Structure 1
C-alpha cells in the first residue's frame, strides 16, 4: 500500500499511497499501462523532501484542527519549489 518516489540525484522516498495521491499528476500516473517506482528526472532532493512533508501536513490537518500552525519554508528553495508544485498539484 506504499509508493516509491526517486529524486534526480538518487534518493528514494517511500510514502503511503493515500498521502501521495494528493497531487493530480501522480494520480495521472499509476493509472494507465498497468496499475511502483515513479522516476522524476528534474526534482532535486531538497524539494522532494519538502513535498512529502506538505502531503503529510495537508492530509493530517484537513478539516479537524481548530488552529493550524504555519508551514515552515526557507527562502533558498522558494523558486524551485514553486515550479515543482506547479508541475504537480
Structure 2
C-alpha cells in the first residue's frame, strides 16, 4: 500500500502512494497488460528523481490561500528537468 520506484542508474526509491495518483503516466503504467508493484523508469538519471520526489511531496506541502513560498529552484539541472517534465 506504499509504492517504490526503480532508478535506471541503480538507486531506486520508496515513496508514499498518495503521489502515485498525482502524476502523468504513473497511473498509466501501473495498470494494464502489466501489473494487474515496482517499475524501473530507465529514462532518467538518479539525481533528477530527488527533485521529482521533492516536488511530488511539495504538492501536498501546500494544498487548498494568498501566501505560498517558492519551490527550491534547480540552478543548473533545469535543462534536463524540462526534457523530463513532458515524459511523465
**If the length of structure 2 is used for normalisation, what is the TM-score?**
0.86
Consecutive aligned runs of 4 or more in structure 1 exceeding 4 Å deviation: none
Quote the residue 1:42 is aligned against.
Answer: 43
CA distance in 2, matches of 1:77, 1:54: 14
Give, in angstroms, the shift of residue 75 of structure 1: 2.3
| Residues 20 and 55 in structure 1, CA contact (< 8 A), matched pair in contact too | no
Instruction: Name the SS of the counterpart of 2:86 in structure 1.
Output: helix
- List per-residue Cα deviations over 1:58-84 (Å, max 9, x = no partner): 123121x64211011222110111111
| Residues 6 and 12 in structure 1, CA contact (< 8 A), matched pair in contact too | yes
Instruction: Name the SS of the counterpart of 1:57 in structure 2.
Output: helix
CA distance in 2, matches of 1:12, 1:26: 15
CA distance in 2, matches of 1:18, 1:72: 21
Which structure has the highest helix share of the two?
1
- The alignment yields a C-alpha RMSD, in angstroms, of 1.5
| Residues 6 and 38 in structure 1, CA contact (< 8 A), matched pair in contact too | yes
